[PDB]
Write a protein that binds this ligand. Structure first.
Ligand SMILES: OCCN(CCO)c1nc(N2CCCCC2)c2nc(N(CCO)CCO)nc(N3CCCCC3)c2n1
Length: 1218
């Protein structure tokens, strides 16, 4: 994929002309990883990594020679100064130009100040000065981009080399260091601490071109306006600390919101997760109250932080006005006079040095501090203790064989008992050694010592040959199954087909789409544990070393395939292979040609299976121990009157900005047309200060008002969205996962709260400044309106042409970045397997090929943005040229003030135009947040919580519940679930439910609570359920859910969230489940704050809590579901006895998976695949041998069925015959 950057000229590499073809393709179709362009040979990850590693090794070597700490920063500087001195040369040129061009502005204006139409010599000199002005702006606009590319390229190169050394080191970490670190800490300095290098370079050069320029400019100012410059200059310096006390006060209001944003997001997580429980309990007004309180207390801090941000941005807007105003007030007051050449040079000098001092120099300071911190982190990571490379082997005679003598080892230099105690045994070719021992013996550590991963303390280990190893936990990397097996070995058809058949892989391959070519990412997302183990075994077989180690291979797989693998591969294929096995299944020990027993780190006995049969020790004995979106985003914030006032306030701010400099222009003109006489100073300074103050106040007012309106729009959108997600029917929560729903509450509203109202105000600010500049140049030279239409059409078409590719290549440098982190993860988790094979260097090449695929989209993201900015500055330079020259070919009409104003504003168009366009892109990029928030504010809604027909207070009087032809569906057009459900429930009876899993057992609760408005009728005490609103239907029915949940809060809440009960009642209820005592030993009485789902509580305890809830509600209906799944039998019978003897006079339906739970129930639904068929007393249904109840009783067993039938008969005979 050749790179046209390689075959291009200089006249082609300045205008990035090599990149037009890609853009053309980008205009037709979408871009893929083929359309991309490969990288230069001077940028492949391997080359940079090798070079920087060379310098880093030299530097640490000299550190050892000198006994002082090695510094990575010195290595980076030593490898990169020779190539970062060139870019310094050019930024020196660029700063000199930004300082020179005001002086030629001065000379042009000075020609206008002494206009004489006949002195054509002066006209020719002024034309020369304008030509020099356009040369300066054309080296500031066209040759500043073949520079910025390389300044970002030095940062790219540094970062890619750093990533390569980081992976290289993390591939050879000693286990002692490996354990003390993590694998989240070795991806956090490759995803977030090696990105700083992509940015520090961009600004590094301003640590010396920042101050130097701020002196050069000062000197120039001194030559023109004299001492007064200091006055103005003083103010500029004050913007350095004031900018860093809007930062150590905004960072105290921005990390005092996380303690509220995260509370709200966590409460979201609980509300969205357990929404079926909240709806069934009819609680969501409580969570609505909680979330309203949290959201209001984060809007307080969002509103303070945004008011402060707006004040900062208005200071940035009006700083230039205040500098110029104080400069020229001091300039005039010391007794000098205003002429139009010094005024509009000094303005431009202040423009340049303000853009450097207040914006670029502090940014470079921040970014160099961040890159130094990151270099320190990678510095520490590169000094972790390594692994002894496999050293000079003892001279052998070609006998591949394993022998260990008197081996003792520790995993810690502080452990008392050694991991191994003097182990001395061996294995030869063809001898399938095996290890037998319960968990805690050290067999895993035994194989680890075999691999050398455990440092020998005494004895000796002699392993001579290629080693194939299998970890206890199978490990799969990002790649296809054939590539998974090959692990770098070239494919061989027969040697792979025998692998396929001996591993019994055919079933799994026929399951998946690509046969054996299905791509398997990290953690085996496309595989199962048995598949992982089998593919790991296949890798071990195909790598085909001498000595093989197999640790617990067959435990997690089926018996037959495990037998096949052990017999026709381990017993058969490996009978000619050195092998060590750690096992847990006894049947295979007969096939072990040797047996090793390990215990307490000490050898117990070695021998064949026969000698341990004769030993008298059975193994088991040992083994046991669009535009509409903008309109909706703006309508929410305020009514349109405030919006029209907002527009007038923007316009007043901009117009007063422009009119201040216009006032200097008019002042200068009124000084020229003079004469001693003087000029009335009080009037002029009065209006000058009036215009400056109007600029400042209108800037502050515009910024605060825009922030307030957009923050208020965020608040209104969130309140609407949330109060419309609490009312969405559970069907919606089923369609959308928990991840996406709670993503538009944390990330999206996360934008809408603090990044639209800042990007959308910055965009408005600089857009109105661009319009200010263009309208000044059109009010002076009206003819400019003609060429400036072919700089509107060209601009719009340019931006369309460019955003159709900068949106196809700013997703390629994102969807090819993750594979780097994924490969790093998959290689650290499989680390022992990798380092067991001598092929760790091949994983280095895989990392590079995953890093020459992100440094291949960073290349395009760095040069397509430049192909855009070169052209934008061609447009801005055409404008500056037209203003500079067209101000002369019409010299007869203009004057010094008009020309100064028009020209210096055109000079500031540079850069301001580009920031305006960049924010336009970013705002159109973050209105997707608003589009999603507004997509949720328009969801479905279940029936309203209240109806006109409120129920009688005593209702339900008894508990009569009648199902009349209830036909219920989960979703429209789906399978009919309950079909003609016609049943009667007379007061207080206990009705079990029987059926198949999902055959309608758990749908009766779904329809009875109207979780999906059912078809049919349900009468609760002769009242239709559909005819009453929900919270007058769910408040009057209790339920015991499958998995109880406790909602984060005081235990006073998880029982009485509405504060409708009193401490005596709560204590009594908790007593009825006998857990009252179990609570009154916690820090608080009830008010112990809890973790998720009451993690300090047990499942049985949670069930007790919900049973207490049911007791507290004391309504005369009740529904139980999945009483005890795996709860301990004591708590089982506990809950059972409270279930009967607590709720005798409260109608009970029970939906249980077992029979003893429901054997004694008064009646039983029988649900036949979504159909009620049998419903009567259990004894009657057992009388008929053909009843499904009889059949499913008989399916348990003989003694079980006899006991159950006896119990049902006992109930019948005690009940119906007194
Ligand atoms: O109203 C100023 C807002 N801010 C401060 C907010 O944090 C701001 N930040 C910039 N940066 C952010 C990212 C790291 C530092 C730069 C930045 N960068 C450029 N440049 C890149 C143009 O594409 C010039 C360098 O090429 N130009 C800027 N202007 C803005 C318009 C008037 C003056 C030119 C500018 N402004």
């Amino acid at each position: 994929k050749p790179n046209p950057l390689q075959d291009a000229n200089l006249c082609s590499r300045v205008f990035f002309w090599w990149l037009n073809p890609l853009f053309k393709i980008g205009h037709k179709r979408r871009l893929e990883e083929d359309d991309m362009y490969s990288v230069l040979p001077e940028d492949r990850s391997q080359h940079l990594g090798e070079e920087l590693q060379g310098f880093w090794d030299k530097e640490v070597l000299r550190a050892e020679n000198d006994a002082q700490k090695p510094s990575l920063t010195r290595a980076i500087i030593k490898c990169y100064w020779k190539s970062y001195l060139v870019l310094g040369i050019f930024t020196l040129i660029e700063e000199s130009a930004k300082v020179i061009q005001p002086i030629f502005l001065g000379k042009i204006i000075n020609y206008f100040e002494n206009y004489d139409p006949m002195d054509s010599v002066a006209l020719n000199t002024a034309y020369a000065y304008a030509t020099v002005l356009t040369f300066c702006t054309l080296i500031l606009a066209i040759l500043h981009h073949l520079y910025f590319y390389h300044v970002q390229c030095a940062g790219m190169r540094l970062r890619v080399a750093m990533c390569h050394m980081i992976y290289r080191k993390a591939l050879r970490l000693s286990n002692m260091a490996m354990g003390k670190t993590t694998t989240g800490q070795i991806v956090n300095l490759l995803s977030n601490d090696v990105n700083k290098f992509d940015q520090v370079t961009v600004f590094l050069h301003f640590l010396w071109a920042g101050p130097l320029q701020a002196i050069a400019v000062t000197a120039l100012l001194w030559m023109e306006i004299g001492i007064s410059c200091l006055a103005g200059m003083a103010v500029l310096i004050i913007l350095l600390p004031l900018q860093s006390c809007f930062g150590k006060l905004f960072s105290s209001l921005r990390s005092k919101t996380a303690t509220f944003t995260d509370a709200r997001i966590r409460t979201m997580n609980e509300v969205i997760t357990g929404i079926r429980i909240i709806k069934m309990y009819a609680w969501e007004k409580s969570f609505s109250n909680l979330i309203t309180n949290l959201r209001k207390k984060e809007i307080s801090k969002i509103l303070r932080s945004s008011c402060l941000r707006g004040m900062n941005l208005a200071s940035f807007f009006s700083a230039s006005k205040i500098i110029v105003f104080v400069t020229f007030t001091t300039y005039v007051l010391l007794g000098s006079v205003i002429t139009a050449s010094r005024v509009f040079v000094a303005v431009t000098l202040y423009g340049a040095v303000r853009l450097t001092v207040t914006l670029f120099f502090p940014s470079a300071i921040e970014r160099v501090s961040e890159a130094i911190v990151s270099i320190r982190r990678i510095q520490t990571f590169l000094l972790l203790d390594e692994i002894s490379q496999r050293n000079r082997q003892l001279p052998s005679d070609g006998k591949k064989m394993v022998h260990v003598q008197d081996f003792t080892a520790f995993w810690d230099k502080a452990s008392e008992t050694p991991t191994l105690q003097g182990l001395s045994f061996t294995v030869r070719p063809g001898e399938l050694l095996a290890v037998v021992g319960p968990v805690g013996a050290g067999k895993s550590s035994l194989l680890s010592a075999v691999l050398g991963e455990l440092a020998p303390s005494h004895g000796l280990v002699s392993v001579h040959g290629r080693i194939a190893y299998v970890s206890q936990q199978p490990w799969v990397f990002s790649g296809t199954l054939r590539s998974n097996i090959l692990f770098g070995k070239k494919y061989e058809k027969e040697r792979y087909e025998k692998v396929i058949k001996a591993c019994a892989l055919k079933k799994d391959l026929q399951l998946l789409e690509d046969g054996d070519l299905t791509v398997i990412g990290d953690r085996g997302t496309t595989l199962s544990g048995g598949q992982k183990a089998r593919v790991n075994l296949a890798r071990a077989v195909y790598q085909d070393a001498d000595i093989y180690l197999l640790d617990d291979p067959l435990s997690a797989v089926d018996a037959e395939v495990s037998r096949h693998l052990f017999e026709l591969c381990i017993c058969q294929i490996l009978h000619e292979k050195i092998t060590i096995l750690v096992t847990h299944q006894l049947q295979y020990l007969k096939a072990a040609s040797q047996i090793l027993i390990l215990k307490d780190g000490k050898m117990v006995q070695k021998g064949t299976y026969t000698e341990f049969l004769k030993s008298g020790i059975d193994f088991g004995s040992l083994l046991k121990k669009g535009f509409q979106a903008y309109k909706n985003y703006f309508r929410a914030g305020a009514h349109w009157i405030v919006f029209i006032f907002l527009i007038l306030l923007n316009t007043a701010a901009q117009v007063a900005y422009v009119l201040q400099d216009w006032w200097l222009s008019y002042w200068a003109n009124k000084q020229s047309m003079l004469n001693t006489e003087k000029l009335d100073l009080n009037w002029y300074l009065g209006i000058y200060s009036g215009l400056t103050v109007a600029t400042v106040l209108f800037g502050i007012a515009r910024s605060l008002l825009v922030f307030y309106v957009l923050v208020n729009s965020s608040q209104t959108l969130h309140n609407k969205m949330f109060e419309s997600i609490l009312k969405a029917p559970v069907l919606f929560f089923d369609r959308n996962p928990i991840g996406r729903i709670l993503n538009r509450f944390s990330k999206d509203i996360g934008h809408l709260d603090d990044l639209l109202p800042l990007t959308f105000l910055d965009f408005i600010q600089t857009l109105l400044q661009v319009v200010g500049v263009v309208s000044v140049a059109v009010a002076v030279i009206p003819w400019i309106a003609i060429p400036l239409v072919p700089l509107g059409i060209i601009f719009i078409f340019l931006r369309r042409y460019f955003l159709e590719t900068s949106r196809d290549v700013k997703r390629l440098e994102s969807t090819t970045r993750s594979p780097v982190f994924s490969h790093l993860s998959s290689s650290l988790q499989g680390l022992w397997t990798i380092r067991a094979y001598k092929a760790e260097e091949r994983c280095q090449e895989l990392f590079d090929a995953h890093q020459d695929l992100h440094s291949e989209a960073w290349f395009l993201f760095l040069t397509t943005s430049r192909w855009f900015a070169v052209r934008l500055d061609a447009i801005c330079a055409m404008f500056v040229i037209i203003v500079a020259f067209g101000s002369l070919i019409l010299a007869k009409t203009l004057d010094a003030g008009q020309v100064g104003l028009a020209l210096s504003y055109a000079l500031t168009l540079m850069g301001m135009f580009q920031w305006c366009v960049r924010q336009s892109a970013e705002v159109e990029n973050m209105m997707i947040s608003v589009e999603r928030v507004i997509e949720y504010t328009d969801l479905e809604k279940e029936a309203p919580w209240e109806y006109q027909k409120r129920p009688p207070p005593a209702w339900p009087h008894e508990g009569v519940i009648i199902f009349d032809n209830v036909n219920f569906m989960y979703s429209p057009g789906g399978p009919l679930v309950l079909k003609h459900l016609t049943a009667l429930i007379k007061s207080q009876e206990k009705v079990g439910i029987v059926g198949r899993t999902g055959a309608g057992k758990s749908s009766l609760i779904s329809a009875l609570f109207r979780l999906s408005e059912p078809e049919g009728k349900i009468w609760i005490d002769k009242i239709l359920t559909t005819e009453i609103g929900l919270h007058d239907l769910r408040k009057k029915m209790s339920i015991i859910p499958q998995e109880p949940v406790l909602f984060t809060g005081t235990m006073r809440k998880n029982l009485d969230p509405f504060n409708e009960h009193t401490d005596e009642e709560l204590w009594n209820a908790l007593q009825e489940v006998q857990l009252k005592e179990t609570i009154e030993d916690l820090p608080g009485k009830m008010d112990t704050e809890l973790a998720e789902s009451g993690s300090n509580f047990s499942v049985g305890q949670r069930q007790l809590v919900c049973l207490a809830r049911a007791i507290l509600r004391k309504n005369q209906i009740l529904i139980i579901d999945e009483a005890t799944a795996n709860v301990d039998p004591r708590t089982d019978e506990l809950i059972q006895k409270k279930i009967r003897e607590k709720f005798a006079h409260c109608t009970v339906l029970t939906i249980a998976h077992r029979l003893n739970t429901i054997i004694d129930s008064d009646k039983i639904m029988v649900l036949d695949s979504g159909r009620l068929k049998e419903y009567d007393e259990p004894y009657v249904l057992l009388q008929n041998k053909e009843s499904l109840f009889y059949k499913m009783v008989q399916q348990l067993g003989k003694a079980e069925a006899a006991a159950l039938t006896e119990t049902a008969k006992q109930v019948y005979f005690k009940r119906n015959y007194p």
